[PDB]
């Protein structure tokens, strides 16, 4: 049933990014023996939890999925009440609380709201973390958007000397809508994923978390940019290439002179 899995992933690849959760559950309802085989490479939105003791929010994924509970980084507690989970290193717990702090600053600077979370775990010669960012559109506004970001980062620290090897994998799951009069309703799905790795020197002024912050910042700038120009301009190009606004036989004139100049440019070769 391995070909069945390949076609299943391609089906999710071509599936409409509006009902990712429901249709993923449906596809799992086909072959439930292949269920938690798909929940590793099928990108879907996030789940907002609620830290009761702190009064914050924290997102849900597999990295915080300790057993079947979730480690709330604002409290380092598990919900459902599992007092047998895998607590992170106390060292990494302090590094994680400052990580959550720095990314709250990051999130507030670019997203001006939204929910974020940064979990962490070990490595033999380093550590690794995940960065969840979920920005839903302004509910008051008509723009029904939902920015979703997941950043798999793996700090492969070298021997000593404080130089590292920062491996990072990201993912953006966009969502957009406008109920504008000129467009009626213009829905706009979309999703990206990239990888980047750099070896920035670690120091007392340049900790690991700062290097990760620069990488996440650059990565999201590239993804948002890349999206907006390449992919969205590509869609605009497709709509313009399908139907043209200019009347034909006028386009035959401009394309006529265009082919004339094609002959002119390829005439003096």
């Amino acid at each position: 049933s391995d070909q069945q899995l390949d076609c299943a992933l391609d089906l999710m690849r071509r599936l409409p990014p509006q009902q990712i959760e429901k249709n993923l559950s449906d596809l799992i309802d086909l072959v439930p023996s292949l269920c938690e085989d798909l929940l590793s490479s099928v990108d879907q939105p996030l789940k907002i939890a609620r830290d009761k003791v702190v009064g914050k929010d924290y997102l849900l994924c597999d990295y915080n999925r300790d057993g079947d509970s979730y480690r709330s980084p604002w409290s380092n507690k598990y919900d459902p009440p599992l007092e047998d989970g895998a607590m992170p290193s106390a060292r990494l717990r302090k590094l994680e609380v400052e990580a959550n702090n720095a990314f709250d600053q990051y999130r507030d600077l670019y997203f001006e709201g939204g929910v974020s979370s940064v979990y962490l775990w070990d490595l033999d010669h380093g550590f690794a973390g995940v960065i969840l960012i979920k920005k839903a559109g302004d509910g008051s506004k008509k723009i029904k958007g939902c920015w979703d970001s997941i950043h798999v980062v793996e700090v492969q620290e070298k021997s000593s000397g404080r130089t590292a090897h920062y491996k990072l994998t990201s993912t953006v799951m966009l969502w957009l809508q406008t109920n504008k009069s000129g467009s009626g309703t213009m829905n706009l799905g979309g999703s990206l994923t990239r990888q980047m790795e750099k070896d920035e020197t670690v120091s007392d002024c340049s900790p690991h978390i700062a290097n990760i912050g620069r990488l996440v910042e650059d990565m999201e700038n590239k993804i948002r940019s890349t999206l907006n120009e390449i992919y969205f301009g590509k869609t605009k190009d497709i709509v313009n290439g399908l139907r043209s606004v200019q009347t034909f036989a006028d386009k035959s004139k401009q394309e006529a002179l265009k082919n004339d100049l094609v002959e002119a440019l390829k005439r003096k070769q």
Partner: protein, 43 residues
């Protein structure tokens, strides 16, 4: 064969892991050589 490929495929994996550790020890000494070169750079 179930058993014979168990022996040889896990053996190829064991030898592959041994070669992994060979390149690992190489890389260990490589970063040791790296830090030595940086020590000279420091001087």
């Amino acid at each position: 064969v179930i058993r014979q490929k168990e022996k040889d495929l896990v053996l190829a994996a064991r030898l592959g892991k041994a070669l992994l550790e060979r390149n690992q020890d190489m890389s260990r000494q490589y970063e040791q050589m790296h830090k030595e070169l940086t020590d000279k750079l420091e001087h």
